[PDB]
């Protein structure tokens, strides 16, 4: 019915993302100096500080919107990998499953409030 507790449960699972090893290169914006053609490739560079900060800062309305930002971390991995064998393309597929594991039940709860809230 808590329309609100969301909020605590990305921050507990962002906690836990921060944890992985497999997060370990998203959890700061890209290096250009370390990767001098991201911007060609990548229009939205996006990572977990961001989307923590985004969070803390109050500038999510919904878990939806951080499922999208957290996603973009994803995608621009996929998009940026010279091959589907690459070590950190690799690290964000399971960083993804587990993401993805872990915000079902935050969604779901999150969007069942909000049908009770306006019924
Ligand atoms: C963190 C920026 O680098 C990547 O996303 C990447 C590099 N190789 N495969 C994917």
Redesign the pocket.
Do not use: A, G, Q, W
């Given at each position: 019915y808590d329309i609100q507790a969301w909020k605590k449960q990305c921050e507990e699972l962002l906690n836990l993302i921060f944890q992985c090893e497999d997060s370990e290169?998203?959890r700061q914006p890209?290096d250009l100096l370390?990767?001098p053609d991201?911007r060609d490739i990548i229009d939205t560079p996006m990572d977990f500080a961001t989307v923590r900060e985004t969070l803390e800062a109050g500038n999510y309305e919904s878990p939806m919107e951080l499922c999208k930002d957290v996603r973009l971390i994803f995608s621009?991995?996929?998009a940026?990998?010279?091959?589907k064998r690459?070590?950190?393309?690799s690290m964000?597929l399971r960083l993804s499953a587990f993401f993805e594991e872990h915000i079902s039940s935050v969604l779901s709860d999150y969007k069942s409030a909000l049908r009770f809230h306006k019924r």
């Open positions: 290169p998203f890209v370390e990767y991201y621009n991995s996929k940026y990998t010279p091959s690459s070590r950190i393309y964000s």
